[PDB]
Amino acid sequence: GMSNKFLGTWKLVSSENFDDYMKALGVGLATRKLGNLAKPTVIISKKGDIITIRTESTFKNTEISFKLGQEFEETTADNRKTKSIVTLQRGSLNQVQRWDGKETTIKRKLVNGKMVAECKMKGVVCTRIYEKV
Ligand SMILES: CCCCCCCCCCCCCCCC(=O)O
Ligand SMILES: [Cl-]
């Protein structure tokens, strides 16, 4: 299952190409400005086989709870209503979000103790790096 090393509180330390990723998602200008300024904390926890990923920032908080491989309803930080599935591939926690015939993926993996989130939409790729608090 998901490595226990994912469990805990993570702080954003680096964000590359987030503005173009937000553009690809249809996020408007004023929202992108705040999005690019945000330095969220991400908290990963687990109760039995239910995994929870909570994001906290001054601008927006989000939270998803899910079982691996089972599709669930999600509300994203930019207020999309998606149907999502989180899978595990070679240690990586891979989230796919589907809405209005569109799709984006967020793959989270551990690299030398950091958590790296790769966000992909229509050929645009954003990389966000988190450090364990
Ligand atoms: C709380 C994150 C930024 C707030 C700005 C909200 C509007 C755009 C963000 C939508 C996509 C968020 C993807 C985050 C991926 C990650 O966990 O690093
Ligand atoms: Cl913030």
Question: Options 2.40.128.20, 1.10.3720.10, 3.40.50.2300, 3.40.50.300; which CATH number does 1-133 get?
Answer: 2.40.128.20
Listed by start position, the domains of the chain span 1-133
> Which residues are paired to 104 by β-bridges?
97
Q: Using alpha carbons only, what angle is made at residue 94 by residues 93 and 99, rounded to the nearest 5 degrees?
A: 145
Tokens of 14: 């680096």
3-class SS at 50?
strand
Report d(CA 97, CA 106) in Å as an integer. 8
Reduced to 3 states, what is the DSSP secondary structure of residue 105?
strand
- Give the H or E element holding residue 20: helix 18-24
Pocket of ligand 1 (CB under 6 A): 22, 27, 31, 35, 38, 40, 42, 55, 57, 59-60, 76-78, 106, 117, 119, 128
Do residues 67 and 53 lie in contact, with contact meaning Cβ atoms separated by under 8 Å? no
Resolution of this model in Å is: 1.9
Identify how the structure was determined.
X-ray
CB neighbours (10 Å) of residue 119?
A: 22
Q: Which two tokens stand for residue 69?
A: 């491989």
Mutate to test the pocket of ligand 1, among 21, 63, 97, 106 (most ligand atoms within 8 A of CB): 106
Report the C-alpha gap between 119 and 127 in whole angstroms. Answer: 6
- Report strand pairing: 81-89 vs 41-47: unpaired
CA–CA separation, 111 and 49 (whole Å) = 24
Pocket test for ligand 1, best of 78, 86, 131 (most atoms within 8 A of CB): 78
Q: Which residue's structure tokens are 């998803």?
A: 64
CB 4: neighbour CB atoms within 10 A? 9
